[PDB]
Structure formats: C-alpha cells, structure tokens
Design a protein around this ligand. Sequence first.
Ligand code: FNR
Ligand code: FNR
Ligand code: DOR
Ligand code: DOR
Lengths: 315, 312
Amino acid sequence: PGSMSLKVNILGHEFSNPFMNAAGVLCTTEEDLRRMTESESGSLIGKSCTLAPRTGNPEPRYFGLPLGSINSMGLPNLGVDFYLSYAAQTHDYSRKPLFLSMSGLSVEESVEMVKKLVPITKEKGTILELNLSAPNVPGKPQVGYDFDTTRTYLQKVSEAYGLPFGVKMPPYFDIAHFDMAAAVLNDFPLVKFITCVNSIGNGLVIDPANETVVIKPKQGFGGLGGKYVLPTALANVNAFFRRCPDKLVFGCGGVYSGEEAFLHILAGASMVQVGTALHDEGPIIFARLNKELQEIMTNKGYKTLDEFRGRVKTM
Amino acid sequence: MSLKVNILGHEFSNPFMNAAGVLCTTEEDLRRMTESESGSLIGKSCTLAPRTGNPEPRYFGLPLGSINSMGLPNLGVDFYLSYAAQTHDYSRKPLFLSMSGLSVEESVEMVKKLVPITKEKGTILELNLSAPNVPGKPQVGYDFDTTRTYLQKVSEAYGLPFGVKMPPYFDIAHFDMAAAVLNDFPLVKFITCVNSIGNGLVIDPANETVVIKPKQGFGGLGGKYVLPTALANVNAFFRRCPDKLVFGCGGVYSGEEAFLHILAGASMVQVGTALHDEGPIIFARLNKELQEIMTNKGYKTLDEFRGRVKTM
Ligand SMILES: Cc1cc2c(cc1C)N(C[C@H](O)[C@H](O)[C@H](O)COP(=O)(O)O)c1[nH]c(=O)[nH]c(=O)c1N2
Ligand SMILES: Cc1cc2c(cc1C)N(C[C@H](O)[C@H](O)[C@H](O)COP(=O)(O)O)c1[nH]c(=O)[nH]c(=O)c1N2
Ligand SMILES: O=C1C[C@@H](C(=O)O)NC(=O)N1
Ligand SMILES: O=C1C[C@@H](C(=O)O)NC(=O)N1
C-alpha cells in the first residue's frame, strides 16, 4: 500500500496484473501456453477442452473484421489429458497461476473431466473455469441460456469437483435473465468467480463483393468478439458484480487498450481477459496493456485497482 | 432498374423506412418522414394512454452507434390512430403503426381500435414484443409462453394481417423455438429483425460515469454494434418462416448494409441510429447507393437477390 501496483488477489493467490488471455486464444498447444507463460500476463487459461481430442469445424472458421472477429472454431482441443499433463508437469507456476477451461458436451462428460482435475488442483493450485457458453457446436445450445440445465451442471460439478471454481457465462440482454442467472449461481458456494462474457452468439457476416458468408460452418453463423461486444460485456460484468457480492467477476470482451481494461475494472472486474485483440497483436499486447493501464491510473491519482474496482458512477 | 417492393397489396417506392421510435413520435416527425424519400414510415411504439418516458439523459450517440433508454415516450394510441385516420397522406406512401402495450390486456384494447382504420385506410400493424427499456417489464419475445399469449389474443382481437418486432436471438435453439411460435399464427405476415441489443452499459472513462440515467446506465444498443446480429436474425427467420416476410432492422448506414439485409432475406429495410444521426435526408442517399450496387451487379429488381445469400 502507498505504491502503484496492478496486483490482484483471488482466494489467497497474488497475481502480478489483472490481464490474461480469453479462453480459446493462444492456449491450445504447448507452444501457445509457453508463449502465454513467457508474456507479461498476470495469468493464462487453457483452451476449452473435451474428454477426447477435437479438430473442430472446417475452414474458413475465423474471420478478422474492422470492428472485431467472427469465429466458429468448434472447440479444437488436444483433449483433457493433454491439459492436465500440462498443468501437472509442464506449467511454470513460479511465473504465474494457471486456469483450465473445460467444455464437456454433456454433464456426464464434465463430471468425468473435473474428477481428474481434483488431484492436480490440490497439488499445483490449477484453477477451473467451467465453460457454459460455447456457441459453435452444431446441435448443442449455449448451456447458460437454460437455467435448469445450468443448475444441473453446477450441481454435478460441485459434487464431483468439490473445490472453488468459476463459470464462463454467455452474454445476457434482459434484466429478468440477470436475476435468474444470479439466483442460480448464488445457490452454489463453490462458484467463486464469474467470467462475463463469451462471444455474442450466432452473428452473420456477409461479403457484399461476392454475396457469400465469410465462414463455412453453420451457414456462416459464428460468435462475435472485439469492439462489437464492449457495452454488452460491461453490462454483464456490472450486473453480476452487484447481484453476486460474495463472488468475483472476470471481465471479457472488447479489450484493445488500457482504456477498455479500466472500464471493465470500474464495472467490477477482478481479472481482465483479452481475446480478439490478442489474436491480432500477439502476446506483446500484455506489455502494452500493463503500461496503458498504469498511465490512466497515474492520470487519475489511483495507485491500486482496489481504489476504482466496481466504483462506476450512476446518476 | 427498380427499388420497388410490392407486398401486402401496397407498392413501396423503395425498401426504406424509419425504425420504430426514430423520427415518428409527434405529428411534425411523421410529416417529415412522409415528406422524405423513404418508401414507408412507422409510428412510435404506442400505449393506450400517453407516456413521457424515462428520466434524462436517456439517449447517447456513440462512435459505433447509440445507447437509449427512452422508456416508450408517446402521445397515446388515440393520437396515432387519429394521425392514421385523418392526417396521413396515403398517396405519398403506406403507413405502419407500432403498438407496445405493457400487458396483453392493453395490447388487445389498442389493436381493437385499429381494426376500422386498417379496414378503411390500410394502416399496417407492427406489434412490439421487444421493448428493453421499461423498468420491471422483460422483453416479451424472450418468454415464448408470454409471446404465444400475445399472438393469440392479438390475432383474435385484430383479426387482420400484422407483423411483430422481435428482440435479437443469439442461440439456434431460440431461433427454432421463436419460429415454432410464430409459425402457429397465420395472421403474422411479417417479422421485423431486430430491436436494439438489450441492456448494454456505456461508461465515460473521463468522468468514470455512465452516460444514461435510467436503470443504472443500462440501455438498448443500436448502430454498427448490431449489424451481424441483425443479419443473422433476418436470415434465420427467412429460412424458418417461409410463409412470412422478414423486415431487416439494425446497423444500416448505407446502401451496402441495405444490400446485405436484402441478401439475407429482408423485404423492407428499417433505419434507426443512422437516421437519428443524419436526419430524413439519409433516405435520398440510401436510394442512390442501393441503385448503384444493383447496377454494378446487374440486378433489375430486389426479387432477384432477396434471400439469395450464398453459403460455403
Ligand atoms: C478464436 C476464438 C476462440 C475462442 C473464443 C474466441 C475466439 C475469437 N472464445 C470466446 C473468448 O474467450 C471471448 O469470450 C470472446 O472472444 C470475447 O472477447 P474479445 O472481445 O474477443 O476480447 C472462447 N471462449 C471460451 O470460453 N472457450 C473457448 O475455447 C473459446 N474459443
Ligand atoms: C431513440 C430510439 C428509439 C427507439 C428505438 C431505437 C432508438 C435508437 N427502437 C429500436 C429501433 O427501432 C431499432 O430496432 C434499433 O435501434 C436497431 O436499428 P439501428 O441499428 O439503430 O438502425 C425502437 N424500437 C421499437 O420497436 N419501438 C420503439 O419505440 C423504439 N424506439
Ligand atoms: O466457448 C467458445 C467456443 C469457441 C469454439 O468454437 O471453439 N468459440 C467461442 O466463441 N466460444
Ligand atoms: O422497443 C424499443 C423501445 C424504445 C424505448 O425505450 O422507447 N427503445 C428501444 O430501443 N426499443
């Protein structure tokens, strides 16, 4: 205290800064995870994994846009065994804490996956982010848009895993939905953080030149990231910050600079995840974001994030 | 070369109209829309009695569009019906009225009054099931049970062709469920996709304060934020609701975005944020731009490419 710091605390762990990759970006392979570990990021998270490996959807399945991105990756991943081995043997925990995202396509699959994480969480401190918002799996709706199904996942994972974990939520657009989602989450004491938000699901981008969609899967429909999602993300962060006071909120969506990171934290974010901008710029972005956030804080006379986290002013 | 749209018996000069809520609250607003180069116009979403709406500030223009929490300010259904019955010049262009009762009971009462005027003048109803800015009223369209009730009661009470203004959906199962409901009501002849993306939050980094007063800063997003969402919704319903027309609304600033909406399946193309920014002279620009694109591609009518977007 009394000195400028970007440090963050979560259940004992101390993080150097609030920044990490958004799940799915620069975190699928050992090489990806090494580059994230080597970066100036406060933490990193592994690709949303499934019990068995997946190669994902056919190409093209990612398209960069002026205002962000559209993707239908289809959960390409090396399978849970790979991520667990990485967490257990490979990751350098002296550099930074590690999160793993898990996206079992059924409650049954999720239970089996999280049971395997338990020993490694105990041994190494690996943190779980349960993905309830994957929008690009043909035939599987975003779990988080069904509160009955969501309650089932949270119950079974709480029983099987039995340790503090977090959830990656879809964006909500209705006050009643904020209320219902919070009511479910507030029934699970083991849920200690909420990541707001996953991509804005099932957008469509068309090229006027050739009258053709720009991605191949699902007739061109894909999740939107980047500048498109910033107001949505801030609203979700703030809505859950207020409704779930005993839980932390991680902000994800539209972060390209210190300015957006500042707004996320104002809204209530503990950690700030970076997807599209990281895909564009590479891991050097974390060095830039640390600098830019420090600049804004200096200009406003803040030394720590604790001075302005959740202090957004209403009228 | 032709921008004409022949639907519901009417001949629209071009596909363009205002989005409900933009330049359509007062008599002066409606006159300016009628005098514009738009193919049509729609009245502000109305209630049985007048409303003054939410406290200020409740609108903020952004680089990438707009946030609003207007709260359904309107002069009441009698004013809009009176406009439709006596004032509007039908030889200039057809007229839609948006109605947004806060209960099914209110909606029923309003549409019953429209029946005679539709019959005599041809006024077209758009039923608003997607208002996101009324404190303590969730968007009807996100509750399929409640949506069904509104469509049942309105179908019974109105008993004429009408359309529905839908909230944006983000999930295939929701496209399926919404279409399932809509396809049970033969009188629903058009679907307008989409209303604003509900309950976004804008914060000014300079003063660390939200930009609108209602609902702790939470308001509906319009403009460049919504184009991909709007296109997806237009196309989803175009394919799932073949017995219905689809109107496109969201992120139209130019002929190019209009072209995309029509390629996705749109019959009419509504303009909100860009019209709020530029005024009714935008419609002159849009007609020229769409014309130019059609010329470049060799299309003589909108029918030649409506809903003909190509997939891989
Ligand atoms: C290429 C790619 C791949 C993925 C994603 C995104 C992109 C662009 N996203 C969503 C991501 O974590 C994030 O929530 C959104 O992209 C919004 O953040 P940005 O606006 O992109 O920073 C994602 N989310 C998740 O929980 N698990 C995943 O495996 C993926 N995969
Ligand atoms: C100031 C203002 C007022 C309203 C709106 C918007 C704005 C900006 N919108 C939503 C509008 O009709 C449209 O669906 C969205 O704004 C998306 O279109 P744009 O991206 O803005 O072109 C709206 N929609 C509706 O059905 N009834 C209404 O009364 C209003 N009112
Ligand atoms: O959670 C997810 C899954 C990912 C993918 O498709 O792999 N894409 C996304 O946008 N979010
Ligand atoms: O349907 C509506 C209602 C309007 C308002 O708040 O008056 N604003 C909107 O964005 N959509």
